[PDB]
Each structure stands twice: as structure tokens, then as C-alpha cells.
Design a protein around this ligand. Structure first.
Ligand code: PRT
Ligand code: PRT
Ligand code: CL
Ligand code: CL
Ligand code: CL
Ligand code: MG
Ligand code: MG
Lengths: 378, 207, 376, 206, 77, 78, 77
């Protein structure tokens, strides 16, 4: 019995996982992202520098026996990317990708994994919406290479709109925390009630009620909000990415400006990619603080792609034990040359140790018929 | 089944819910007590009803076995309503979660032993008061626990306070107000909003 | 600053590591080894079932907050292979391979890594020396595919020889533990001293002193030892594998029958593959544990210093020329870029006029309605 | 100063009453008419508590009751670590079983088990080398598979009629169940003189 | 199989027409909710015509899908 | 399609009429390289509407059908 | 429609064989119970062959319906 949220990945699924990990990584590299492979463990000083409380609780602690200091098993690779970018990245644009195991103390979703294979990409040093657009192009090039029948739906948000309204309205922390709870639960009636007594209340009502209609959202806001440079630009970025997703990538997009998960770490646009009707996003991404250094990025659990992808059925070959042992030395070398060529092409060929040696999932035998080794289906 | 599945709490909550339903499109054809049936058709052919233990409603909704449901706020806080939307305060089946001990009895000079169904709520409440407690899990008759020494205090839902007073107990601390709430499954909210909106609006109008 | 024995693998090294991991894994798969990918964490009950004390101390512990039970971060994948083979493997021959990160509490050798990328292969259900021979041929086929200039030296041992002598001599645990320390340190003088008072002492001295000369080792042992069936066969297996390594693979072989690391888990022949003159073996393997098993593993990250890939093609599209294009021109350029990327070119679409990839080799430039690659 | 006896309310209480009366313990009032929690008996040294079946082992383990009658299904699920299971009373007999929908195939995934008996389920499926996602429920196990909340259930079955009336069938036998006599470790040492005659009469009553 | 037609009967079909005027009064979000509802009716075997004009009437009309106080309900003709 | 016209002329009237069909058809020569001469032809037709709304409705029916097939293959429209 | 075949997939079929020997050992009441069970499986889309002989085997057999201690269960082959 394994712990909850911990599963073996076996056999054809393991092979599929290895193919996905490799092919997605190679794609990222061809788009100009530098692969990095940080370690599973670090001192907490670096691993949880500026971490949220959720990330801290999600991170297993262990003690370094060489120094007596605290370490963690990583729950997230992104902070390691920041460490790496700070040492190696310079002031200009730097692009990174990664694919590695991470461990969580508790699952995120119902029956979720505590050991995802986290794959991702990040761009540092570009303030423009063009960096987010590039990340979308990389993501969708990757998704389309998987030839899935499952449909990816994208939900866009932008935490700056709410953050700026909260500043201009001069909300207290408890007022901010209440609206976030009401937004999280879509409690429109009680939101309507609370907003009648708050300053710029109708703006906070408008986000929830009309935030889905992003084309018209600026024109539904109050004159103070429409004069705020950061709100106008954030709404503009949403329209740009929505358009790019529909037109370039045939992607269904919804907008939710009340999506305020990761209020702590997101600094702008946010992206959540859903697979069919599964509750937890397959892909999570958006703007964050790369430090003043801009950063944007996404990540996903490669293991969640296994249920939605298919490889071609393998060719699993057994050489006939008896026939092979009847061969002279020159015949054996010719047969092994043939076997090497089959293996170069991806055939899985077992040289039998005994007459009973049989591989799992046998599709073919390599058999001798009139001085000729041919493949025959079983 | 392509319509909505509605998870209702069996006991005290079910009585005050029936008027809210009838004002919407929904009303049961049979009665829950007389019939030994689990799944109940309604006046609306698009709505199905499940009569469940109050403690099970959030589980059924969160896993999507029901699309939405009526559940006590005491149950939601204890359960952790992490994967559901709490859409409406229905303002029915109102009560309070409280601490209660024996009448005029002194608190002992040790970690308080709390006997309760609401173990997460108890732990959380006493943690917010900076007190360390030993929690004992019980499922029924909280009133009894202090009388035979099983804990020092209890945590339980209190309305009039008569059950506490009839067993020689008194309320001590107010933890929070409680009422039944309308909860909806995250996925159902996106996929079946057309079916939900008219029912949600009629519940909203009924208070 | 990372902890001691903990290092990032960055950039071209990371790409190389990923290529090695993938190519070695694929080779194993084509030889009929079933890939398995067990998790980083398990309950200790399964992860450390029948573990040595070294493996227990090497394994980090963490608490499962859902059950209150102890878990461990794996220091070794082999015990997870046993668990898997017990459930899925049956009674016949089963072949497995794997490649995954493991974590160690302390480094294994001086200045060793505490986070190796462990890759390996294992055959269960064959008692014959033919299974060990197959593993050698897979290993050396993998090593030769890496086109290294570094040479692998192989040291063979066999723990049964010492275990049988210890039985026949009826050694106590403290006597066994002292000889193992003296063997570990090749303290020949003090071994000579201790063996003058032990039963069959001259046999235990002979292993250390003359165990390298395997052709003549049986003839240097006592009559009781020469009559033991298990000693004669173990020595015979050493000679067979030595010969196979020299003849089939042109491999320098040394013998050490006092190599008793992993006394706990090894049940027979043991294999240690050294890379140039580096202290810790690159490859560790042997017979282990009624179901037969043999296997090897290695740290893929230790191959990085001894392997090279072809230099990458790193391309930058001209910022100015790209922005001068109409929509149809951009779509044609992106089609061209997709094709270059399919061929393994690393092509950066610039965000700004200063956006430059690290290690730029080529520019994709527009001259008279044609995008061509030019070296920088 | 006397003994406190923890009884399970509902199904178990019916078959316990004859065993008590043979022992010289018998209730003066009735549990149905009265909302009293603590009941005096014919024996002045014995007191009775009528509790939820799930609460009996808790009251005994903490010494709020000295001894009690509790279902074996409840003891296995609770973990009877700090109490003595002295006698199999052979009353309220049933089986813990797995049940799914009639003739329905097991899906190609981790089986989702809906049950009150989460520790028993986990343990049973672990002993069959199967990995399961367990879902905790408190009532109406029969319903869970019919609306898709779980592939199988685990529940107490006697005749099998409740399963068959809801289109379900039993799959695996986990274990036999009956009510047991449990005693608090400390009470057994300190109040054996009071206990022995009652323990011997229960022993004689089957 | 064609000779069985004179000797067999199916259940009468449910043939539904959406109100032309009411549908065109809807905003975009209202239309998407209505189409979600229509997709669900069609999944259940209702035959639902989205009208092109105010005269567009399916053969054998049994029901209209009509708007009353922000609710689309089925009414028999 | 020509049989649909015959049917619409007799039964369709002057207003809007909608028809569908699925039947075998035979061709003397294939259309494309190694194409079928015996397709199972399935289709839908709207008569009596001049508006672009009728074409839009046909697209909605087609794409509702295509999406129900849960294909990984991508349909491109010219 | 035939050009869709290469681009679409159905769920793998359940192809069931009733044990010839066990079926012929049954009394009449046992046979009627078994046939009731078979009718229910077929209603759900299982493809169930009642064997004519001990060699009668359907193509692509996935399951046998077998008798074990007075119970007919499906077992994968
Ligand atoms: N007063 C309430 C009460 N008021 C509202 N509710 C809601 O009803 C839900 C529980 O419903 P049930 O009636 O099925 O539960 P129960 O009666 O505690 O237990 P059961 O025996 O029915 O299983 C809770 O989650 C609350 O949200 C109440 N649930 C229980 N009570 C109890 O009713 C009694 C009356 O209290 P006083 O009015 O203070 O004497 C006391 O025992 C209270 O604990
Ligand atoms: N058959 C039993 C049954 N038999 C013996 N017991 C014992 O009774 C204890 C529980 O007593 P309860 O009064 O709480 O039983 P309950 O059914 O939960 O009663 P409610 O509290 O829900 O009113 C268990 O711990 C068992 O030791 C049983 N408890 C419950 N059942 C249920 O009774 C129903 C009838 O079963 P069949 O007749 O076999 O279908 C099924 O739903 C069974 O799950
Ligand atoms: Cl992840
Ligand atoms: Cl009071
Ligand atoms: Cl049954
Ligand atoms: Mg991240
Ligand atoms: Mg035509």
C-alpha cells in the first residue's frame, strides 16, 4: 500500500511518461528555453525565500546532518529558477525550462497527486505582453503535438484590476478578505449587499457581475477606475491574449477578473488551462515577481497527460531459443546484426536465456524458416 | 440522468427547506419518512432529490454525485468546504455553535478535554483563543460526556439552550452563528448554470 | 549556496543529462527491459523492508500528515523493483529498468553527490550465469554507445567465498566484523596476526593476499575449503565472467574476493565498474535476493564529464525584419521556423531588438524576400 | 463508585436485554419513552448508558464507562487498542462485505470505495494488494454507487435484502461480525470483584 | 425491415419550437444559456428547432419553448 | 441531393423545410486517388431561406456532430 | 460516413461466453435465472454467446460467464 496521492507509473504508462517528458523538454529547448535541472533538496533559506504560507506548508522539512540546518524537499521548482536567474541571468531577457519531480505534503484536489512530474517554462526580463504571448505559443505548440481528443479550455484573469480598485477605494484588510471570499464562492447577492456600503462598491460588484464581458468592462467602471493607468492596461492585456488565443490557436477562452488564487505571488495576468471537465487546472501560469525583475511562466504535471495521450502499440519480439542455439558463429553474428537494426528502429527484442523466457505482451517471434529470419505475428 | 441532483439534509434542516423549494419549481411527490426510497422525483422533471445525513451532503456535492445541496454551516466548517461554492445563506435552521460545561463547575488546572462531533471546529476555536486542548471524537449525545467525566467541556449546536439546561449544563463561549447554506459543485456551476439560475433566483427571492 | 553534495545541473549539461537519461533508457527498453517509474516516497514499511542499517541511515524520513505514519525519500530504487516484481512479475523470468532521482542523507564517497540520477536494469527468475552475462553485454553496449575516451575498469568479487569460509570456520559475529574491517582496509600485517589464532585462519589470510590470482586461488585453499561445492562454483563463476569480459569486450578485469560491501544484500557475484581512476565506482552490480535476482545501477550525472554532444545550432530571427512583415509573410516565416525546430534548431523569436540567446551560432536574416541562415 | 455499563442504542440493544436480565442487571424505565441519558438498574452497583454504537468504545477506552457492549465492526474500525475484548456475545450477527452494482464491471482505475468503515476498507483492500481511494460516509451506503459516488461500498450485511432491493450485489466477504463485551484496562484491575459475577453470567448466557 | 413499418409504432415524438421574438431579445450570455438548455433537451431526444424567421414552423409541432420571467419553459400547443 | 429536391417539391411547400438523410450511393469512377466508389452519404439540407442564418445553422449542426465524435484529428474549413 | 471510421474509436466490446458444461448441469429453474441474467447483460450491450457445443468460441473473447459456488460471475480471460 502506497500513501494517498502516491502511485507507481508502470510499464507502457512509464514508457509513455518518459516519451512525454523527453519530447516536451526537447520542444521547449527548440523554442529557445535553456534547460535547468535543480536538485530535489535545498536549504530552506533559498527554497522558501519569499514563499507563501501555502508553499511553506506544502514543503516537507528534513535536517542536513552535515550542518544541522533545515532543508526542504521542493514542492515547486519556480523559486529555484529565480535563484538560478539571479546568479546567471543578467539584466536582459532570459528563458528557462525544466522538468522534475516535486513532493507535496497534502494533495491540492480530491484524490490529487502528491508527487507530480512538474514541467514548465519561464521568461525573465520582459515587461511586455509579448512575453506572455510567446509563452502561449510555446504551450499550444506543445499541446497540439500531443494529438489529444481531449479539449483544453483556458480561463484568463488579471489580479491587478482588483488590487488597484482595492487601493483607490482604500479598502481595509478585512474588507479585502471578505470580497475575496465572496468572489471565491460567487456569492452575488451578499456581494451586492456589502458593495452598497463600501467605497467604489459598484466597481467591486461590476467585476463579479460583468467581468466575463471583457470588451465592455472598462466602460462599465467608474470614472476614477477608468482614469487609472494600471486598470486600463490590465484590461487591454486581457483582450490581447484572448484574441491571440482564439485566432492563432482556435482556443475557447473565458475571462474571470475575480479569479484571485495566489493573490500573494501573482502580479498581473493569470492563465488556467483546464482539460475536459477536470476540476484542477492542467496548466497554471501568469506574471510573478522575478526579484525589479519581470517574470512570467507556466507549469503542468506531465503525469496528468498520461490518461489523454496514446503511443503507437509497441513491437515486442522474441528470438526463438532453439533455432538461435542451432546456429554457427557466422550465422549468430548475422542474426545479431539484424537484431541491432531492429532495436535501432525501436523494436523491443529479447534474446532468450532459456526455452521458457517470454517477454510480457509478446507481439512477434523472430523465427528461422528456410535459412531466413523473419518476423511473424503471434 | 441529465437534470440537476439536489442533496438535502435529513432532519431539522429538511422541514424549513420544503417552503423554499415549493416557491421554486421543486416539490417532492412522496414523503421522506413514509417511503424507504433513496432517490426522489419532483414536480420539476429536471430536478432529482437525495435525502441524506446532514454530514454527507458536502461530500456528495464536492464529488459531483449531487450538483447542489442544502447543508448546515456547522457541517461545512467541520468538513472544510474547499471544493464547493457557498452561493447563498438561506437563513433557515438557525442556531449557534458553542462551548458548554457543567453548571458552575471550575475549569481544571490542565489541558482541557473537549468532547465533540465538531473536532476541527473545536481545535480551531480553542487555537484562536490560544488554548491547547485534547479533543475526543463523539457522534451523539454530547450532553452526556461531561456528566460521566469524559471531557471537561463540549462543543455542540445550541438554539434555545433547553437541552443543555435539562442536563445540568450551561453555555460558556459563543463560537459562531449557524444557518443552512446552498452549496454548488464547481463543475455543475459551469456546465448546468441554465438549469440552476432560475432555482437560485427563486431561493434568493424567498428571503 | 546549496548543501554539500548538492549541485544544479544547468544549461548544456542539463540538455546532455536529459539526452543520456533518455537514450540509455530507450536502449534498455529495446533489449526487453520493462521500464518502471516508482515514486520518490513510500511508507518505510515497504521502502526499507529488509534494508541494511546503511540504507536506513541513508534514507531521509518524513511524516505523512494524512495517517501520522513514517515515510522515506528513497535512497535506492532496487527495493521498489522487488516490490513491483513481487506483485507483477510471476514465477518466470522478468526484466526491469528504471531511471529516477534518489536522495542520500550523507555522501557515499568523499565529495560524492547526495542527489544522484540513478539508472539501472535488473533480471529476476534466472539462476544461471547467463543472466549475469546478459547484463554485462547490455551494460557494455550502453557504455560503448556513449563514445567516451574514458576507460571503464571492472573489479569482480563474490561474497559466497567468504560466507562459506565463515560457516566452515564457525566464526563468531565479532570475528566476522573484524575481518571485514581488515579486508575493507587491506590491513595485511594485522590480518596476518589475527589469522594465526582463528580457525581456518590461513584461508582468510589467503583471500586477501592471493585473491587477485583467481586461476590459482582454489589450489591455495585448505582441503576443507577445496571440498566445499559452493566455493568451487563461486571461483568458477569468477573465471567465466573474467574471460567473457576480456574476450567479448577487451575489458581489464581485476578480482577481489574480499570486496564485501553490501554483505547484507549481495548473495553471490559482485561487479564494480570504475571510470578512469575515480575512487567511487561508476557502476555497482551483482546477485541479490525464493527468487533469483541480478542487476546493476549507475549515476547518470557522473557520465556528464566524460561525454560530449554535437554543438547546438542556436538561431536568432532578426527583430527589425520580422516586424516589417505583413500577416501572410509572418505565417510563412513561422511555418519555416516550425520546420527548423522539428530538425533540432534552437530558434528564438526576439521580444526586443536586444533579445539575444546564450551561445548564438546563427542569425535567420531576410535578403530579397528570402529567409536564410547565416553563421555569426 | 459502582460500575458504568455502556450499551449500543438501536439494533444491538434488543438482543442485549435478555443477557442483562440473566445477570441481575435490568433497566427500571424504558429508553424509548424517557430522554434520560444515565439509567439506574435492578443492581444498585451498576449504572447504564445508552449510547450510539460508534461511541461505546470511546466511552470504555477513556474509562467514562467501565465496560460495554459494542459491535465488532465498530471495534475494528475504531481500533480497540486500549480495551480488553473479553467475550464474543454471539448477538447482532452480520458480515462486513464489499458490494457494487449488479453485474457492473470494475473500472480501469484506483477503485473508489464509499464507506463508514474507512480503516477496515483500507486494510482489507491493502491485504488484497489493491490500491483504493476511500470516501467517508456516515449513512445510506446503498445510495453511493447508484449516483456514481464510488465504485464499491463496504457495509454490514445480514440477509442481503437492502443490497438486492437497491440493485446491488455482495462481492467479497471481509469478516464475520457480532457484538462483543469490552472492558476498560484499569477497571478490570481495580473493580474485578464487581465485574466477575456479571462476566460469569454473560458467559453462561451463551 | 421495410415491411415491419406498417405493423410497428414508436412513441409520439416531442417536436419543440423556440419563440423567435424572445430569442432575438436575448443578450449574448442569455443566448449561450438558452443554447446549453437546448443541447440538454436534444440529448434527451427532444426535436428542437431554432427558428430562422417568425414563420419558421416544424411539421407536427407539439410544444413551444417560451420565455416567462427569465425562465424558458416547455408548453404544449 | 436531387432526390431531396424531388421530395421537397412534392411535400415541402413555400416555407422553410429541413431534411436529412443517410444512404449508400454508387459512383462509376472514384473522385480522389484510391477513393471509394460506394460512399455512405450522410447529409442535411434547408430549403426556403435566403438568409445567411440558414448557412450558419448548418454549420452549428455540422460542428455539433463533429464534436460528438471526440476525434483527435483536426477539421480545417475552406 | 465511412471516412470517419479511421478517425473515431468506440470503447472496447465485452464479448462473453457462457460455460457449456456448467450450463448443461443446471436444473430448469437455474437455467431461467441464468437466462434472466444474460438478458440483463445484453440490455447493457454485452455480447453474450450461448454455446451450441463445448468448442463454440466467439471471435475476440474477453470474458467467460462461469459458475463458482452457486454464483455466475464474469471473469476476464
Ligand atoms: N437545535 C439544533 C439545531 N438547530 C439547527 N440545527 C441544524 O440541523 C443540523 C442537524 O440536523 P439533525 O436534526 O439531523 O441532527 P441532530 O438532531 O443533531 O442528530 P440526529 O439524531 O438527527 O442525527 C445541524 O447541522 C444544524 O445546522 C440543529 N441541529 C441540532 N440541534 C439540536 O437540537 C436540540 C435543541 O437544542 P435547544 O433548542 O438548544 O434545546 C439540541 O440537542 C441541539 O444540539
Ligand atoms: N444489518 C445491519 C446490522 N446487523 C447488525 N448490526 C449491528 O448494529 C450496529 C449498528 O446499529 P444501528 O442501530 O446504528 O444500525 P443502523 O442501521 O445504523 O441504525 P440507524 O442509526 O441508521 O437508525 C452495527 O455496528 C452492527 O454491529 C447491523 N447494523 C446495521 N445493519 C444494516 O441494516 C440493514 C439491513 O441489512 P440486511 O437485512 O442484511 O439487508 C442494512 O442497511 C445493514 O447495513
Ligand atoms: Cl505540477
Ligand atoms: Cl445556559
Ligand atoms: Cl448478493
Ligand atoms: Mg511554479
Ligand atoms: Mg449532394
Amino acid at each position: 500500500m502506497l500513501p494517498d496521492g502516491v502511485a507507481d507509473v508502470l510499464f507502457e504508462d512509464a514508457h509513455k511518461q518518459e516519451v512525454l517528458r523527453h519530447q516536451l523538454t526537447q520542444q521547449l529547448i527548440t523554442h529557445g528555453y535553456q534547460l535547468v535541472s535543480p536538485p530535489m533538496i535545498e536549504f530552506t533559506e533559498s527554497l522558501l525565500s519569499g514563499a507563501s504560507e501555502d508553499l511553506k506548508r506544502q514543503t516537507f522539512k528534513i535536517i542536513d546532518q552535515l550542518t544541522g540546518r533545515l532543508m526542504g524537499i521542493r514542492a515547486d521548482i519556480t523559486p529555484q529558477i529565480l535563484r538560478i536567474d539571479a546568479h546567471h541571468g543578467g539584466d536582459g531577457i532570459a528563458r528557462y525550462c525544466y522538468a522534475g519531480d516535486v513532493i507535496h505534503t497534502l494533495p491540492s484536489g480530491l484524490f490529487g497527486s502528491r508527487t507530480p512530474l512538474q514541467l514548465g517554462a519561464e521568461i525573465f526580463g520582459c515587461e511586455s505582453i509579448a512575453a506572455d504571448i510567446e509563452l502561449i505559443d510555446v504551450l499550444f505548440s506543445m499541446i497540439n503535438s500531443l494529438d489529444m481528443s481531449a479539449v483544453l479550455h483556458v480561463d484568463l484573469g488579471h489580479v491587478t484590476i482588483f488590487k488597484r480598485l482595492a487601493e483607490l477605494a482604500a479598502l481595509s484588510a478585512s474588507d479585502t478578505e471578505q470580497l475575496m471570499q465572496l468572489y471565491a464562492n460567487k456569492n452575488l447577492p451578499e456581494l451586492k449587499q456589502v458593495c452598497q456600503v463600501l467605497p467604489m462598491g459598484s466597481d467591486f460588484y461590476t467585476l463579479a457581475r460583468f467581468g466575463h464581458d471583457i470588451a465592455n468592462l472598462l466602460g462599465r467602471l467608474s470614472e476614477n477606475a477608468q482614469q487609472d493607468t494600471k486598470i486600463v492596461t490590465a484590461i487591454d492585456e486581457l483582450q490581447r491574449l484572448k484574441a491571440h488565443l482564439q485566432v492563432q490557436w482556435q482556443c475557447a477562452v473565458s475571462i474571470d477578473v475575480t479569479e484571485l488564487s495566489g493573490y500573494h505571488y501573482h502580479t498581473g495576468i493569470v492563465f488556467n488551462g483546464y482539460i475536459n471537465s477536470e476540476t484542477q487546472p492542467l496548466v497554471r501560469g501568469g506574471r510573478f515577481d522575478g526579484m525589479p525583475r519581470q517574470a512570467t511562466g507556466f507549469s503542468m504535471d506531465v503525469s496528468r497527460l498520461l490518461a489523454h495521450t496514446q503511443l503507437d502499440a509497441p513491437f515486442i519480439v522474441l528470438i526463438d531459443y532453439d533455432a538461435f542455439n542451432n546456429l554457427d558463429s557466422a550465422q549468430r553474428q548475422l542474426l545479431l546484426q539484424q537484431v541491432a537494426s531492429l532495436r535501432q528502429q525501436g523494436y523491443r527484442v529479447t534474446m532468450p536465456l532459456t526455452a521458457e523466457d517470454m517477454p510480457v505482451g509478446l507481439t512477434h517471434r523472430l523465427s528461422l524458416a528456410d535459412n531466413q529470419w523473419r518476423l511473424h505475428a503471434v | 440522468f441529465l437534470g440537476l441532483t439536489l442533496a438535502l439534509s435529513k432532519g431539522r434542516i429538511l422541514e424549513e427547506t420544503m417552503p423554499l423549494l415549493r416557491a421554486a419549481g421543486v416539490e417532492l411527490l412522496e414523503d421522506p419518512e413514509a417511503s424507504r426510497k433513496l432517490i426522489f422525483p419532483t414536480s420539476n422533471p429536471n430536478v432529482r432529490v437525495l435525502i441524506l445525513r446532514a454530514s454527507d451532503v458536502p461530500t456528495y456535492v464536492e464529488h459531483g454525485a449531487a450538483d447542489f445541496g442544502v447543508a448546515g454551516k456547522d457541517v461545512l466548517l467541520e468538513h472544510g468546504a474547499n471544493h464547493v461554492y457557498e452561493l447563498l445563506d438561506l437563513k433557515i435552521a438557525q442556531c449557534k455553535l458553542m462551548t458548554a460545561g457543567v453548571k458552575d463547575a471550575p475549569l481544571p488546572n490542565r489541558r482541557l478535554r473537549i468532547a465533540t462531533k465538531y473536532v476541527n471546529v473545536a481545535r480551531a476555536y480553542f487555537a484562536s483563543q490560544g488554548q491547547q486542548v485534547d479533543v475526543i471524537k463523539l457522534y451523539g449525545s454530547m450532553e452526556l460526556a461531561p456528566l460521566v467525566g469524559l471531557g471537561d467541556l463540549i462543543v455542540d449546536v445550541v438554539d434555545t439552550g433547553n437541552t443543555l439546561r435539562a442536563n445540568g449544563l450551561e453555555a460558556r463561549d459563543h463560537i459562531c452563528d449557524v444557518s443552512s447554506r446552498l452549496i454548488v459543485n464547481q463543475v455543475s456551476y459551469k456546465r448546468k448554470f441554465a438549469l440552476l439560475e432560475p432555482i437560485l433566483d427563486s431561493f434568493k427571492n424567498s428571503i
